[PDB]
PDB file of C-alpha atoms in Angstrom:
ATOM      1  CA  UNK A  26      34.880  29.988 -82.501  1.00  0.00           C
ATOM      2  CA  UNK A  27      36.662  33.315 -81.075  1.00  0.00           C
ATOM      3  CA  UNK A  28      33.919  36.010 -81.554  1.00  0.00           C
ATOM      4  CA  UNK A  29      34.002  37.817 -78.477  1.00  0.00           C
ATOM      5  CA  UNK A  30      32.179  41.401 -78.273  1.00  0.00           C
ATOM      6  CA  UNK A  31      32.961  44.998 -76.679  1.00  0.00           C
ATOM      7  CA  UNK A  32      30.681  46.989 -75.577  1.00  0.00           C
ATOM      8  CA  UNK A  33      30.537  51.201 -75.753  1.00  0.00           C
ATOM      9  CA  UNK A  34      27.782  54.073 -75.757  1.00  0.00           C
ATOM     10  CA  UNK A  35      27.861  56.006 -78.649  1.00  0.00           C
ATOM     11  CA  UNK A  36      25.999  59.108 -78.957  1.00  0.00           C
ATOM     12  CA  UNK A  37      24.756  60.771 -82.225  1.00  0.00           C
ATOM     13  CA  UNK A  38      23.609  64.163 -83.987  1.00  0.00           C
ATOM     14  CA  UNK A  39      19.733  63.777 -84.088  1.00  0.00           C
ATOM     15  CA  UNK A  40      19.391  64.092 -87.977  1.00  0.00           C
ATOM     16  CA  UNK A  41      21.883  62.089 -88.584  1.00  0.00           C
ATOM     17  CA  UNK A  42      20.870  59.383 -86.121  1.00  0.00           C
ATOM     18  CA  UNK A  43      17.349  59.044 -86.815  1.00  0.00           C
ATOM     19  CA  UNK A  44      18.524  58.481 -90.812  1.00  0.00           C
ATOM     20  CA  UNK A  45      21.100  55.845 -90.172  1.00  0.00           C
ATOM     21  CA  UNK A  46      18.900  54.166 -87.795  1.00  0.00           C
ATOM     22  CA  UNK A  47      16.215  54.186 -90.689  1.00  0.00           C
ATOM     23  CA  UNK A  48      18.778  52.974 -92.969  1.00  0.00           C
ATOM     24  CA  UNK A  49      19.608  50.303 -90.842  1.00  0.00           C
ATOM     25  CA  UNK A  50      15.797  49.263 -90.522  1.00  0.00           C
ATOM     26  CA  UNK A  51      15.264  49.903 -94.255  1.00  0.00           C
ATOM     27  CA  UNK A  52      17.722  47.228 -95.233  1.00  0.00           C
ATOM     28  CA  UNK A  53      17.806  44.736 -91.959  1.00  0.00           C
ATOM     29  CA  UNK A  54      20.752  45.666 -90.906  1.00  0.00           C
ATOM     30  CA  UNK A  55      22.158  46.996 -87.035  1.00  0.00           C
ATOM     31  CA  UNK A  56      23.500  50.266 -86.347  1.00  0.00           C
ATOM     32  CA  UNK A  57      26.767  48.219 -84.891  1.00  0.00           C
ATOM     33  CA  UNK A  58      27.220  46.125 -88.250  1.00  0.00           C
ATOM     34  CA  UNK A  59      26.762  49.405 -90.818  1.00  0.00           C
ATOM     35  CA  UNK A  60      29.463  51.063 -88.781  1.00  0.00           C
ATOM     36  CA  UNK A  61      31.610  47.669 -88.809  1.00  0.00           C
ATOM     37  CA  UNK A  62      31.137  47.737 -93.082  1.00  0.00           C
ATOM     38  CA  UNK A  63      31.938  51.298 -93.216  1.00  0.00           C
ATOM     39  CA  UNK A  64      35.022  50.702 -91.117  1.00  0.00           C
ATOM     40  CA  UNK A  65      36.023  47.990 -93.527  1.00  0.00           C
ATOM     41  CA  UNK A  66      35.369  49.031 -96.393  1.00  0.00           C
ATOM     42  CA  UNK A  67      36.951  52.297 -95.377  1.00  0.00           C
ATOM     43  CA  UNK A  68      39.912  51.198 -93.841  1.00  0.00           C
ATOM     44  CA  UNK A  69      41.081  49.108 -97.097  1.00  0.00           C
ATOM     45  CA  UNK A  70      40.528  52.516 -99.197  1.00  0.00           C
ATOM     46  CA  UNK A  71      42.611  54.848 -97.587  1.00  0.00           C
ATOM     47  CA  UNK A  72      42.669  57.835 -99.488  1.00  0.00           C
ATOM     48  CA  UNK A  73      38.978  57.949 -98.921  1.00  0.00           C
ATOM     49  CA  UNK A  74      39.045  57.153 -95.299  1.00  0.00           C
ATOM     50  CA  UNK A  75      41.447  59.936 -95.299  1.00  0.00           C
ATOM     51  CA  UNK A  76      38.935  62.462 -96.054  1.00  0.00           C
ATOM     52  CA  UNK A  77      36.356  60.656 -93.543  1.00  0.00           C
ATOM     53  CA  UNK A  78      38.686  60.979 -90.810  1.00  0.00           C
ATOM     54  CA  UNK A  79      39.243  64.891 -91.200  1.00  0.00           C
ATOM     55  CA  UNK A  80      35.402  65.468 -91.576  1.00  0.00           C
ATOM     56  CA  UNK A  81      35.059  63.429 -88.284  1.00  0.00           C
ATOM     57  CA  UNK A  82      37.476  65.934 -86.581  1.00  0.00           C
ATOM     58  CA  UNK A  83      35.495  68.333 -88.262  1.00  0.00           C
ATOM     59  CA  UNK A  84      32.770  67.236 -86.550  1.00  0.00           C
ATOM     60  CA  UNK A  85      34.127  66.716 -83.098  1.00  0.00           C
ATOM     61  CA  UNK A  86      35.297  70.306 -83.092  1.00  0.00           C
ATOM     62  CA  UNK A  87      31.806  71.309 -84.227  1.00  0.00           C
ATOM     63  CA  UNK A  88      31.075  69.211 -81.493  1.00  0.00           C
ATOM     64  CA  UNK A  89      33.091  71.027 -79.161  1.00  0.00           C
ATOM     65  CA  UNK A  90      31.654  74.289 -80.457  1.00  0.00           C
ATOM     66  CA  UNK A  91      28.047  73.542 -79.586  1.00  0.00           C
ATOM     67  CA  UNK A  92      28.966  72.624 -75.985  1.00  0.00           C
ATOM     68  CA  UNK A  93      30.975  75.649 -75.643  1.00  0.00           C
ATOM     69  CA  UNK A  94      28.617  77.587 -76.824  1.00  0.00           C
ATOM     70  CA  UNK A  95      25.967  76.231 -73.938  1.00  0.00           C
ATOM     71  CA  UNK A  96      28.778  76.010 -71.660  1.00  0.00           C
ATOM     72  CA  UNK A  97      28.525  80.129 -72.073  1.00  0.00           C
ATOM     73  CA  UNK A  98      24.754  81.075 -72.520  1.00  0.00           C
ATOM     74  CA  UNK A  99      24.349  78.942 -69.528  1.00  0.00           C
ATOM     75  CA  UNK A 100      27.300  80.950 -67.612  1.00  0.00           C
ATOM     76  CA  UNK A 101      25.004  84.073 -69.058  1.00  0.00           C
ATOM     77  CA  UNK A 102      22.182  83.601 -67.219  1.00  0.00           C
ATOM     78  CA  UNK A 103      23.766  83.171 -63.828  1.00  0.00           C
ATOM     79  CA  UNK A 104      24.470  87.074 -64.055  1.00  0.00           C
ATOM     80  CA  UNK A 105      21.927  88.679 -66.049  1.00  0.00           C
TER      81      UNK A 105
ATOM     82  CA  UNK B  17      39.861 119.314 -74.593  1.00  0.00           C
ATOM     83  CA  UNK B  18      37.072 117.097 -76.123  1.00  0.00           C
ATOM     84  CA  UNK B  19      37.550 114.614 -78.873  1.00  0.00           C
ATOM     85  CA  UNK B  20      36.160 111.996 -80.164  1.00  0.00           C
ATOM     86  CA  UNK B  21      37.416 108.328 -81.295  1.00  0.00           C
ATOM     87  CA  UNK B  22      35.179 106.443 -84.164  1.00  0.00           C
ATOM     88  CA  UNK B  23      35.262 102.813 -83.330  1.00  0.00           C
ATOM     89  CA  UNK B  24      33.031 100.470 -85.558  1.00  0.00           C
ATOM     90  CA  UNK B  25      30.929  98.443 -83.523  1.00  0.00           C
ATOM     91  CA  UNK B  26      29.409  94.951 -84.156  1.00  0.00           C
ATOM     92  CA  UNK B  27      26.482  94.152 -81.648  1.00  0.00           C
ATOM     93  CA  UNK B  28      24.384  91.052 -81.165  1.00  0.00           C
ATOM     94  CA  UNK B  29      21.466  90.961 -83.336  1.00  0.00           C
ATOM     95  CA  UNK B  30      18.387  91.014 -80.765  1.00  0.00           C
ATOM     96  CA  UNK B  31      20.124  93.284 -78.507  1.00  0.00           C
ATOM     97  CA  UNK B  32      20.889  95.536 -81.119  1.00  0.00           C
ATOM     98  CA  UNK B  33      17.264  95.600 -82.506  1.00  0.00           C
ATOM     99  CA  UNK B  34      16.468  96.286 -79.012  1.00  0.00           C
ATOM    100  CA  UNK B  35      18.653  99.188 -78.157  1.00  0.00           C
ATOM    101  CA  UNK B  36      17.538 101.174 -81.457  1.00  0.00           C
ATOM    102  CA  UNK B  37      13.944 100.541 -80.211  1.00  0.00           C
ATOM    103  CA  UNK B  38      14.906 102.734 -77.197  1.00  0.00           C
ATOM    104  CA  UNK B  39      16.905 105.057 -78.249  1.00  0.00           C
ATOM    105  CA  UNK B  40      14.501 106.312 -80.990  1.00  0.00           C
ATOM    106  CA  UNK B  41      11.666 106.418 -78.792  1.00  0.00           C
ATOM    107  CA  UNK B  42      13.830 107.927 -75.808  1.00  0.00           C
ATOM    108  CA  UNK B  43      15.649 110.956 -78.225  1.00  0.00           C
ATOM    109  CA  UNK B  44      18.998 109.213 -77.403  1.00  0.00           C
ATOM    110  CA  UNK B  45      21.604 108.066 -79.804  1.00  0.00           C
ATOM    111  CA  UNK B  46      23.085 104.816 -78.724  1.00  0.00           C
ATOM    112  CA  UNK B  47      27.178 106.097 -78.450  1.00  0.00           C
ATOM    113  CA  UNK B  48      25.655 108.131 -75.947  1.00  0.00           C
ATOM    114  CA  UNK B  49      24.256 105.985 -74.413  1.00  0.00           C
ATOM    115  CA  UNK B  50      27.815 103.599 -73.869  1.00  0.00           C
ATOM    116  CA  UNK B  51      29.251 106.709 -72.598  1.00  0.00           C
ATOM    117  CA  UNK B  52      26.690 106.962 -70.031  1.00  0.00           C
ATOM    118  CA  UNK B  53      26.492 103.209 -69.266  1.00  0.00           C
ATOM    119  CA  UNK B  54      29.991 103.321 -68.390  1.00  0.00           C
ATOM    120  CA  UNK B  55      29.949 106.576 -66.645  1.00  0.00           C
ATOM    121  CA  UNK B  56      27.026 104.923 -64.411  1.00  0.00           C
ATOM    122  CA  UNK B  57      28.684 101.395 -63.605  1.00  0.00           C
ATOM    123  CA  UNK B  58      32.544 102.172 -63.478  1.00  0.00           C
ATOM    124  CA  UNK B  59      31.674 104.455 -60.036  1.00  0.00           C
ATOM    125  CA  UNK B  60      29.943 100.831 -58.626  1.00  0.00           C
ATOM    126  CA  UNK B  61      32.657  98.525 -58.386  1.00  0.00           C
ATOM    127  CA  UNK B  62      30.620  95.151 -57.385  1.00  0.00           C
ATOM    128  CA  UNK B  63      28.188  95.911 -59.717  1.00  0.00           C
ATOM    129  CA  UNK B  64      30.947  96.526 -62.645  1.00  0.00           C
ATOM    130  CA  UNK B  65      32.567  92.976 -61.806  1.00  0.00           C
ATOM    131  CA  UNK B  66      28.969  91.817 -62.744  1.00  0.00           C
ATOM    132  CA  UNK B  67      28.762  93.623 -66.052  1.00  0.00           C
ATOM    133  CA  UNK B  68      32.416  92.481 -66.716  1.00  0.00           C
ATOM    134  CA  UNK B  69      31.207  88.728 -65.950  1.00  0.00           C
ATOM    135  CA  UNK B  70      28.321  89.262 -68.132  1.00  0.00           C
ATOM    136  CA  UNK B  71      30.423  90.423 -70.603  1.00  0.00           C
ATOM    137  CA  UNK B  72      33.118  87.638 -70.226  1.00  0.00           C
ATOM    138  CA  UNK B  73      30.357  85.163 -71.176  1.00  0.00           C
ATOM    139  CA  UNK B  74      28.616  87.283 -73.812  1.00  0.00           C
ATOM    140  CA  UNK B  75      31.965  86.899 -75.706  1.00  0.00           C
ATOM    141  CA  UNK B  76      32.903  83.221 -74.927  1.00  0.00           C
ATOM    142  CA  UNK B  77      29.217  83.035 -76.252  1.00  0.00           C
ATOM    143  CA  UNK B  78      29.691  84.537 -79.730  1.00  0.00           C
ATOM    144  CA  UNK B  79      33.868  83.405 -80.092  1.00  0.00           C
ATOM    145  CA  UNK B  80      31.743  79.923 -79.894  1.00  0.00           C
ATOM    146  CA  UNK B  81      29.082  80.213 -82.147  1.00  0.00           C
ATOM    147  CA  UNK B  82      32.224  81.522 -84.134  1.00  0.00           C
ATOM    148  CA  UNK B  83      33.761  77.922 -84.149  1.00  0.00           C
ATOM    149  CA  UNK B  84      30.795  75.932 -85.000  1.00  0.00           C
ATOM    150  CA  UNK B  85      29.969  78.521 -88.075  1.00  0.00           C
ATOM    151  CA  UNK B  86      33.791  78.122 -89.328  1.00  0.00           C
ATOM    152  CA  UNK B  87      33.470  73.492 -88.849  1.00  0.00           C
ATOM    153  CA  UNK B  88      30.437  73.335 -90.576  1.00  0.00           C
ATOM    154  CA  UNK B  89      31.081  75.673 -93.820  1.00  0.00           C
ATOM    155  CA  UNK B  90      34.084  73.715 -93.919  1.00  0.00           C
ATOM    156  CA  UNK B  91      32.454  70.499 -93.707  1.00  0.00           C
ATOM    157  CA  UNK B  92      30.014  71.846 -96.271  1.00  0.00           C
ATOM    158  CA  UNK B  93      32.121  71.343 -99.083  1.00  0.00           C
ATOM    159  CA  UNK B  94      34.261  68.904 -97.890  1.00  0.00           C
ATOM    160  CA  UNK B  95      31.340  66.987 -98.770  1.00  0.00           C
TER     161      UNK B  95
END
């Protein structure tokens, strides 16, 4: 049948990796198919993926915030 | 003439710790100090184009940290 696949690195937060990924091997399940229910299950609630989608935002500009903040304290030591 | 303007100051923990630690044990008071940091450097161009850098960073550093510690107590009780 048509069941092709797509392939993508996907990097996580440490404590939060190491938990799903324990999750995932607590119950037999991948890290590709949780993500796939969430997703799902998610995308046919929507005023609850609404709130996912602004914490994940809310995450990438943590993200951001974490880089910039090595992007400086690296740019530091170059002069002290 | 001789005035004086009272700015409040908010300095980096460690380095703050640090510069009471020699003032105290140097009988300096660290305002002073500031006025003679700058008095020093501003006379040595290159080497005031370094402390500028370093300071350029030193706040890019902290306006950072500023954004992470403003998404995560947001994220806190969002839940």
């Amino acid at each position: 049948d048509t069941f092709e696949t797509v392939r993508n690195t996907i990097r996580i937060e440490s404590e939060v990796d190491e938990s799903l990924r324990q999750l995932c091997h607590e119950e037999r399940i991948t890290k590709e198919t949780w993500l796939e229910a969430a997703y799902l299950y998610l995308c046919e609630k929507p005023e609850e993926l609404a709130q996912v989608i602004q914490l994940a935002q809310e995450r990438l500009s943590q993200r951001k915030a974490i880089a910039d903040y090595k992007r400086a304290k690296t740019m530091q030591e170059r002069f002290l």
